[PDB]
């Protein structure tokens, strides 16, 4: 001024001394407003590199400490620090921006103020720390649904794909994390596929890093949701199935689970329904449905439910010993989904071929089904109903089913208000009465239990469902053409014949 001179302007000395005053009483004072904010702003605008650095470190430590929603004016200076050429300023400023980007509103506010291009150009510089931090920012910003569209259509997927291959593990973690967060919507997945990041992920399923391989597994699992993606992946990278199968035995459990789910998503299509079995995933799954951890059980039984759709797999599936663990899973009462998956699996297995039927029966499947045929959710009831409908079409199995007192389960199910349950149960009952050598159990179940077959016929004759009236009539004719006197005079009751209208 007049007595002395310094290299630093007086407003900035003001700022620095005030800042010193604040940094040792963080408790008491809010930093995203007022005094602290004007200090930091002044220090951002300054000529002096050291003061800028000081501001950046300040911002970084503050944002590290606590995260709240902040105004325009908290963000502008950090965005200006981002424009700096000083490496450590870049580091601190990015870290601060990400710590702020933890909070949801701040994500939208940051992206809307145009932070994307700074972050992107930071990522294309070859200082590793700023790569890690800037990519990290993109990662945290890509967790808001509003943003990921705008992030995708900005060209960030290209440096993300690039940096996902980094020899530095921190960078790779943040990068693959971002790529993962870009797989929550269909169009983001489309954009992600276009950038050619799929071969990178597929390759990085072999990463020894837990975080990286988990992120890539989850990302691929999320991509497999779309059918076009599934086809294109079946064409492009054939090795995927194998790698996922091997990942079903990973050190980390979340990886086993997510990989199993990815295999389910893939198993939605038939080519994969076969190729998973070729890759020898049946052992891992057998081990997994018998496991303790119920998410693994859920994933594995959903997966096997999808795989069992293809008939050609059937034998393999039975020869791998799946039946009794599945029947065991039927006892699980607390998870409706596991029940549904297991019973649906059984339905698939039975519906496919009539060859390993013997093994199916020997598994104790039918008795468990009979046991749950009334005490179970309508879902399970429905699948059990379909299953019975399937089994009652094997002429050689008819008398055995009848002998196992299957009518005691079928007859009440025909009261169910669910079209599938009642319908298929009635069809099964009808086909059990058709052309059997012995009508004993049919006779014994004429009135008992639950009003018996007589009650059944009487009711379904008066249904409006044309098909039901017809299965009633057809049942009657199948009983008349039974060449068994007793039953033919059981039809002498003409409740049936004046209602046979």
């Amino acid at each position: 001024d007049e007595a002395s001179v310094s290299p630093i302007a007086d407003n900035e000395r003001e700022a620095v001394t005030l800042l010193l005053g604040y940094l040792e009483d963080k408790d008491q004072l809010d930093f995203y407003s007022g005094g602290p904010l004007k200090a930091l702003t002044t220090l951002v605008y300054s000529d002096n590199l050291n003061l800028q650095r000081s501001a950046a470190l300040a911002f970084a430590e503050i944002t590290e400490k606590y995260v709240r929603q902040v105004s325009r004016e908290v963000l502008e200076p950090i965005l200006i620090l981002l424009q700096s050429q000083d490496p450590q300023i870049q580091v601190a400023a990015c870290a601060a921006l990400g710590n702020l980007a933890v909070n949801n509103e701040n994500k939208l506010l940051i992206v809307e103020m145009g932070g994307l291009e700074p972050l992107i150009n930071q990522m294309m510089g070859d200082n590793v720390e700023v790569q890690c931090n800037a990519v990290g920012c993109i990662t945290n910003l890509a967790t808001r649904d509003d943003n990921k569209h705008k992030i995708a259509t900005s060209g960030a997927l290209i440096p993300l794909t690039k940096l996902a291959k980094s020899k530095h593990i921190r960078v790779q973690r943040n990068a693959t994390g971002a790529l993962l967060n870009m797989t929550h919507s269909e169009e983001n997945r489309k954009e992600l596929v276009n950038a050619g990041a799929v071969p990178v992920l597929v390759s990085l399923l072999s990463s020894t890093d837990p975080d990286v391989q988990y992120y890539c597994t989850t990302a691929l699992s999320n991509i497999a949701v779309d059918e076009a993606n599934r086809k294109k992946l079946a064409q492009t990278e054939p090795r995927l199935v194998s790698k996922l199968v091997s990942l079903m035995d990973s050190p980390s459990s979340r990886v086993k689970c997510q990989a199993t789910l990815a295999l389910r998503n893939l198993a939605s299509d038939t080519s994969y329904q076969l190729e998973i079995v070729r890759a020898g995933g049946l052992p891992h799954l057998v081990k997994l449905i018998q496991s303790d951890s119920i998410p693994l059980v859920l994933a594995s039984v959903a997966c096997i439910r999808n795989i069992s759709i293809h008939p050609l797999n059937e034998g393999l599936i039975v020869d791998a010993g799946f039946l009794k663990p599945l029947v065991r899973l039927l006892d699980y009462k607390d998870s409706e989904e596991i029940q549904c998956h297991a019973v649906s699996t059984l339905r698939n297995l039975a519906a496919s071929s009539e060859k390993n039927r013997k093994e199916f029966f020997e598994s104790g499947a039918v008795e468990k089904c009979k046991e749950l045929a009334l005490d179970s959710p309508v879902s399970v009831q429905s699948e059990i109903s379909a299953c019975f409908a399937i089994l009652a079409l094997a002429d050689v199995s008819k008398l055995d089913l009848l002998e196992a007192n299957i009518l005691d389960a079928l007859i009440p199910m025909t009261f169910s208000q669910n079209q599938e349950v009642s319908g298929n149960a009635a069809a099964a009952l009808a086909n059990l009465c058709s052309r059997v050598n012995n009508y004993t159990k049919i006779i014994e179940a004429w009135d008992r239990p639950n009003e018996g077959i007589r009650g059944f016929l009487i009711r379904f004759l008066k249904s409006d469902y044309a098909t039901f009236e017809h299965i009633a009539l057809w049942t009657i004719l199948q009983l008349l053409e039974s060449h068994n006197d007793k039953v033919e005079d059981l039809v002498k009751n003409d409740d049936d014949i004046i209602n046979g209208v």
């Binding site: 870290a95 990290g136 973690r173 993962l180 997510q258 939605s268 399937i390």
Partner: peptide, 26 residues
């Protein structure tokens, strides 16, 4: 031959995993 037919969408339909990645900094 008159088996009950499985609905085209009667399978375990694919889902998007709910996991969201968190960034780690300096």
């Amino acid at each position: 031959s008159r088996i009950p037919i499985r609905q085209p969408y009667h399978y375990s339909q694919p889902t998007t995993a709910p996991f969201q990645a968190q960034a780690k900094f300096h």
